[PDB]
DNA sequence: CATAAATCACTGCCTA
DNA sequence: TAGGCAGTGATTTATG
C-alpha cells in the first residue's frame, strides 16, 4: 500500500494517496465558478456548483426530496430504511 | 439526532 | 512500487 510521508496514514490506491499528499500541498485546482471556493475534485466541485444552480439528480422516491450528492441520498435513504 | 453543505477517501481501468 | 482520470460512498463540519 502507499503510505503519506507527512502526517502517517496509509492508501490502498495510489491515487487516494494523491488526493491526500493533495490535503498536505492543498492542492485546489477547481474553483466555484460563483463564490470562489476551491476543491481538489472536479466531480465534488461540479457537485457544488449544482448547490448553486440548484441541481439534484439523487431523488429519493421516499419523500419526494432530492440530493447533490449520493452518499447524502444514501444516508438519507439510510434514515428510511431504518 | 437530523438537515444542508463541506471534505475526505474508496473505487474501476491502464502501463513500465 | 509509482501516477492519472472519472464514478461513488462514508465521513465530518456548521447549524438547528
Ligand atoms: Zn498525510
Ligand atoms: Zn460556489
Ligand atoms: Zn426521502
Same mark, same amino acid.
Given at each position: 500500500s502507499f503510505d503519506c510521508k507527512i502526517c502517517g496514514k496509509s492508501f490502498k490506491?495510489?491515487?487516494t494517496l494523491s488526493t491526500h499528499l493533495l490535503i498536505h500541498s492543498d492542492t485546489?485546482?477547481?474553483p466555484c465558478q460563483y463564490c470562489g471556493k476551491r476543491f481538489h475534485q =472536479?466531480?465534488?466541485m461540479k457537485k457544488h456548483t449544482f448547490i448553486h444552480t440548484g441541481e439534484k439528480p439523487?431523488?429519493?422516491q421516499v419523500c419526494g426530496k432530492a440530493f447533490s450528492q449520493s452518499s447524502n441520498l444514501?444516508?438519507?435513504s439510510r =434514515?428510511?430504511?431504518?
Open positions: 490506491r495510489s491515487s485546489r485546482p477547481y =472536479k466531480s465534488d439523487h431523488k429519493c444514501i444516508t438519507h =434514515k428510511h430504511t431504518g
